[PDB]
A paper describes a structure:
Ryanodine receptors (RyRs) are large homotetrameric calcium-permeant ion channels in the membrane of the endoplasmic/sarcoplasmic reticulum (ER/SR). Cardiac RyR2 channels open in response to the action potential during systole and mediate excitation–contraction coupling by effecting massive release of calcium ions from the SR lumen into the cytosol of cardiac myocytes. The N-terminal region of hRyR2 (amino acids 1–606) is the target of >30 arrhythmogenic mutations and contains a binding site for phosphoprotein phosphatase 1. Genetic diseases leading to cardiac arrhythmia [catecholaminergic polymorphic ventricular tachycardia (CPVT1) and arrhythmogenic right ventricular dysplasia (ARVD2)] are caused by RyR2 mutations that increase the diastolic calcium leak.
Here, we present the X-ray and SAXS structures of the human RyR2 N-terminal fragment encompassing amino acids 1–606 (hRyR21–606) obtained at physiological chloride levels. The structure of hRyR21–606 determined at 2.39 Å consists of three domains: A (residues 10–223) and B (224–408) adopting a β-trefoil fold, and C (409–544) formed by a bundle of five α-helices. The first α-helix of domain C (referred to as the central helix) is positioned in the centre of the structure and forms contacts with all three domains. Most of the interactions between domains A/C and B/C involve the central helix, strongly suggesting a significant role of this helix in maintaining the integrity of the N-terminal fragment. Residues 1–9, 79–106, 379–386 and 545–606 are not visible in the hRyR21–606 structure. No Cl− anion was found in hRyR21–606 and the structure did not show any evidence of a chloride-binding site as had been observed in the mouse RyR21–547 structure. Significantly, despite the presence of chloride anions in our crystallization solution, there was no electron density in the close proximity of Arg420 in the hRyR21–606 structure to be assigned to a Cl− anion. In hRyR21–606 this site is comprised predominantly of Arg417, Arg276 and Tyr125 side chains that form a net of interdomain interactions that do not match those described for mRyR21–547, but resemble those observed in oRyR1. Thus, the N atoms of Arg417 are within hydrogen-bonding distances of carboxyl O atoms of the domain A aspartate, glutamate and serine (Asp61 OD2, Glu40 OE2 and Ser63 OG). The Arg420 NH1 atom forms a hydrogen bond to the main-chain O atom of Val300 and Arg298 NH1 of domain B. Moreover, the guanidine group of Arg420 makes a face-to-face stacking interaction with that of Arg298.
Author numbering: 10 to 25, 26A, 27 to 78, 107 to 378, 387 to 544
Write the structure that this text describes.
Amino acid sequence: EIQFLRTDDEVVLQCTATIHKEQQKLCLAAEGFGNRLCFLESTSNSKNVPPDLSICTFVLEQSLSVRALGGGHRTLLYGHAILLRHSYSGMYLCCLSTSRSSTDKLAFDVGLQEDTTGEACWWTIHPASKQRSEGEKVRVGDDLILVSVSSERYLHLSYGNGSLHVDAAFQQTLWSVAPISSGSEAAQGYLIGGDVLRLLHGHMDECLTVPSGEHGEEQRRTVHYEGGAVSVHARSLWRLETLRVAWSGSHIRWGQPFRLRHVTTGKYLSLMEDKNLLLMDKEKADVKSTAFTFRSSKEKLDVGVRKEVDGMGTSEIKYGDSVCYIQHVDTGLWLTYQSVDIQRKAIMHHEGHMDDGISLSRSQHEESRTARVIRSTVFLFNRFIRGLDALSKKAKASTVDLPIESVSLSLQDLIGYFHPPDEHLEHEDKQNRLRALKNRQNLFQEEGMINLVLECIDRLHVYSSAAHFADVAGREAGESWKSILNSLYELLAALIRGN
């Protein structure tokens, strides 16, 4: 009945907070690119608004004892020191040296970091109550205290006079660990929750997607099937997300409901009332409207609450080999196509076509990561452009969201991400990195990233000096004006280099 935690498992860390007088269960979150600091992701509201668990997922990489200064899936014990590697970025949860918190000032920031050298990235696990003691096994759903090895502070939910962040402070916070996947349950070519994938009519040679990264950002909401090069572009990528936190990263089965998120725009596949398909904002992505399922055929689910299996005895879904039928849970309708006598329209219907058979195709790590970096960049840069827009339209600088600091940080990360291989590498090694590089470039180009960079350049160029920008946007904005522009140019050069 009870579940322990072992090294190599994926987990999330949750706490409860009072927001507008009410309790919410939140995950410890962090983005790789563009800001290394931890923040929080609500999970309690999942039936109305789907949480993004990708930024919340950590692997317990090590679990060491007292005399120390992975192993074979050692079990977590109270009093052990742990290392948490962020799944999405390759980085680790660290107690940093900086203090961006006026509230406490004896608190240290907590964020992501790759330098794993000191003690800053180690945390010791401690009992919340008398019901657990040093040496005992940490159970799933145990309330935990985490203590930084370098700084002796608690992993702490801070009510910063604004609102909610995480830090390391001498006040404690109760965290509970939820399991996401097992480090010993292998992938083996099967569909796992959290996967980024493409959905194909294999025989028709096409994939489910949306209109190209061009005009009609509102137009980009519609859904259709398309053959050709789109099958190796970002816009045909979808992230499958289960409806629960626990085990959201294990094997998916026939009948098991899920949302499907369009990676590039971050919107969720949904059925409207007039019964047409449309991508919805996270804020409107309710279960009834966004929940779908795979079915081994179009027969009947009426066998009770008994596990569904294919024509072989296997309950899981295989990449490549399995034929799948997407069903909207709430209406029971099928995801089909319709001919408009390069592409054809995706629709929901009770009959369908005899060849609705979707084949699944796992995306590569490389293209998946890239697709996600694009979504972050577009989101951040759209805020930046909008903020710049309000300012030119005379809005009071204090009321405007202008993410100067994130923009500098993202551009640095982005430039690094497009850095060509240094000469001193072996020839075959350089060739490989040059290939990854071209792919990153192609995916960025197809998503219209060049025009977006040019758009940010143009908006900054309205101003004639740093001091002119300072006058409208404030001193700190003024002092990054030229460095942001330089970075924008550098990034733009990186996008086209070697074409």
